[PDB]
């Protein structure tokens, strides 16, 4: 899973990045687990 609007769904090893536009959030992971 690439992006999500549920923080836990990404299973990021580090704190995810939060992108928020109107008042609604998206989370992305910049810490790739190879």
């Amino acid at each position, epitope marked *: 899973i690439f992006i999500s609007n549920d923080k836990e769904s990404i299973k990021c090893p580090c*704190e995810p990045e939060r992108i928020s536009e109107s008042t609604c959030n998206f989370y992305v992971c*910049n*810490c790739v*687990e*190879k």
Partner: antibody
Amino acid sequence: EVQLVESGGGLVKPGGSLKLSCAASGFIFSDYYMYWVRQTPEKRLEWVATISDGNSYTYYVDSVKGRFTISRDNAKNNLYLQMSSLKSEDTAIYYCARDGPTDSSGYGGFGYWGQGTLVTVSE
Amino acid sequence: QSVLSQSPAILSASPGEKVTMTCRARSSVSYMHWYQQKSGSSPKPWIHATSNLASGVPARFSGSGSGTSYSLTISRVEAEDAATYYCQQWSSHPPTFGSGTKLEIKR
């Protein structure tokens, strides 16, 4: 202001065990991942463990797998590090940390560090 | 895995001079962090995400780079800039720290 205050650091014999606390305040503890990072006597910096927020997801550095346990208590705003089967190599200052503020964050950096607590493993 | 080499280990500069220290990664990393450490205290976040200065860090500092080569520059070194600087990445897990560059000031 964000504050992280570690404690529990001490002398412990090889093979012994010990439990560090980190008392977090000035933010919503449960909104953030938490980390332990240590610095050895030679000053090398090493990530040791991560615990996610939401449902516990834990991660470890290999040299510590099966020996350390990171946990958190959102009721009490605390992070912990149960150590056991301690080795002289685990000797270091242990820092608890988290990502930075809302602009400076999301990119895998350690944005706040506590003042650290020293763990000596010796006879 | 994505291990970091920092060079040089020790850098001597006089006040006013420009220094650059550099941080190489074993394979491509996408963001690089830098900390400043003075003894008796813990690492202070200094540059986040390659090129962004942490609140309070003076404008003489900068970070750049991409791929497997990153760096930190001080356009004109000052006495108070004596410290050890460490790079850190987490583009690839587990996160890794370089072993530091110590900056000595000439006087």
